[PDB]
Structure formats: C-alpha cells, structure tokens
C-alpha cells in the first residue's frame, strides 16, 4: 500500500451539513409526528453532497456545469408539502472557485456563503436527496450519474461495489486513486444506519485517511472493515461498501 497524507488536509478542505452549507436547501415546511421540531430551519445538505462537494473542492472543477437537474421529493417524506419539485440550474452556473472556499468558520464575505451554499444545493439536487433535518440519498448510483452528466467529470467516474472484486483488487484500485491525488467516494452501511464519506489518504500499514463530513469531527485513519469512527461511541460502516472511483477533470 502506498503511503498518500491526506489530501484533502493539504488543501484546507473541511465542509459539514449545517451553517453556512445549508443556506440554499429547502427550508423545511412539516413537524414529523414525534419529532418537535424544524420547521422554518434548512435541511441538511446530506453527508453525500458533503463527500461530493469537498471532492470538487478538491480539484476546483467544474468551471462551468453542463446538465440541470430536476426531481420531486418522494411522497413519502414528511417535511414538504406534496408535490414538492426541486431545481438546480446547473448548465448555467459558473462556479467561481476562489469564492468557494475549503472552508468555513465565521468571517467569510456573503459572496463566499453564496458560493458554497450554492455548490451544496446543487450538488444535493444533482443526487435527488431526500431533504430533511438530516438529509439521505441512494450514494454512488447518483453521485457517479451528477460528476459526468451534470458536472462534467471525465467519463471515468464510476461506482465499484465491495463484492465485486476480491479483497487485493478492491484495495488496489483505493490505491491507484490516492497515487493518482483523487480522492476516492466511498460509502457502507451498519447497525448504526448506512453513511457516505471520502477517503483522501493511506499510512502505507492498510489504514487509509477519512473525511466524514462532520467538520472533523472523527477524521483520522481507519482499515476498510473497521470505519467505526469516535462519534458512533454502534457498529460501523463496513456492509454494503461501494465507492466512486475515476473522479478526475
Ligand atoms: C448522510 C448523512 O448525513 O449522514 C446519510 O448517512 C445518507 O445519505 N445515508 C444513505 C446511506 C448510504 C450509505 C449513503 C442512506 O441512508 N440512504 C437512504 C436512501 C435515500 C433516503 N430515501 C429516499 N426516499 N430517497
């Protein structure tokens, strides 16, 4: 295994769900029986336009999107109103990527909350996210189809599934992505509920580095059948597997 220091660390990069991420999600309109209460705060961007958009940061791309993208949310969610259709224009952003920045603590200029608001939003839309006060959507199905289709990545974005290749071929292909500087969507599922991040980094020891969209919150190194991060305190994330691969301009 190849030794690669964390690449999204070298680049400052740090996103979370909540505020100033959020600021152009759908604002939620519904109590869930039980549940007191949203109603009028954004929803989560979702740890899957989270993983997403800290890997665009990343390679500060695309300039300019391609394709919008338009859904409605499913009618079971209980926190719009139905029909609910969401929008992103997508094929007319020009994404400034000096005002997107790797991260955010406090004093940035509205033009820099806009921006990042902004990519949240649409990144969330481009994978048909549930929307809610934590916000889920079906992962690499979505997130490879959003790279190519609506954000203009190079044709070798794909999903590769955990049961599909033994476990050296599985574990060759993180590499090769790492020894490349593309970090690597990667998601799975446990006891603990199913949740999506990016591995950006390896020790050269089997350990690979972990962004989990939380701020930081746990980042740190883990093994591939043990991505139990501090903050489950519970079974993690280690069925299921399936990342995105190919992610490059
Ligand atoms: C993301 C988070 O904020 O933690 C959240 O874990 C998530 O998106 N989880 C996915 C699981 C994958 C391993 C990413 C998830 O639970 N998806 C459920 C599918 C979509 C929800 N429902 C509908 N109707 N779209």
Do not use: C
């Given at each position: 295994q190849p030794v690669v220091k964390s690449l999204l660390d070298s680049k400052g990069i740090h996103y979370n769900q909540g505020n100033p991420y959020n600021l152009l999600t759908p604002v939620i309109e519904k109590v869930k029986p039980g549940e007191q209460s949203f109603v009028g705060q954004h929803a989560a961007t979702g740890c899957v336009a989270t993983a997403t958009a800290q890997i665009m940061?990343?390679?500060?791309?695309?300039?300019?999107?391609?394709?919008?993208?338009?859904?409605?949310?499913?009618?079971?969610?209980?926190?719009?109103?139905?029909?609910?259709?969401?929008?992103?224009?997508?094929?007319?952003?020009?994404?400034?990527?000096?005002?997107?920045?790797?991260?955010?603590?406090?004093?940035?200029?509205?033009?820099?909350?806009?921006?990042?608001?902004?990519?949240?939003?649409?990144?969330?839309?481009?994978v048909d996210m549930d929307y809610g006060p934590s916000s889920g959507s079906a992962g690499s199905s979505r997130v490879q189809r959003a790279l190519k289709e609506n954000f203009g990545y190079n044709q070798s974005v794909h999903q590769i599934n955990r049961s599909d290749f033994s476990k050296q071929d599985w574990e060759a292909q993180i590499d090769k992505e790492l020894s490349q500087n593309?970090?690597?969507?990667?998601?799975?599922?446990?006891?603990?509920?199913?949740?999506?991040?990016?591995?950006?980094?390896?020790?050269?020891?089997?350990?690979y580095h972990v962004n989990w969209g939380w701020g930081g919150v746990s980042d740190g190194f883990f093994r591939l059948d043990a991505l139990n991060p501090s903050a489950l305190g519970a079974?993690?994330?280690?069925?299921?597997?399936?990342?995105?691969?190919?992610?490059?301009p």
């Open positions: 940061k990343y390679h500060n791309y695309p300039n300019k999107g391609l394709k919008d993208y338009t859904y409605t949310l499913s009618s079971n969610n209980p926190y719009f109103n139905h029909p609910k259709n969401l929008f992103a224009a997508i094929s007319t952003r020009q994404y400034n990527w000096n005002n997107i920045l790797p991260t955010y603590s406090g004093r940035e200029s509205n033009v820099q909350k806009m921006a990042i608001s902004e990519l949240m939003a649409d990144v969330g839309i481009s593309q970090p690597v969507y990667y998601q799975g599922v446990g006891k603990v509920g199913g949740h999506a991040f990016v591995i950006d980094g390896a020790d050269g020891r089997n350990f079974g993690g994330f280690n069925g299921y597997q399936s990342a995105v691969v190919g992610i490059k």
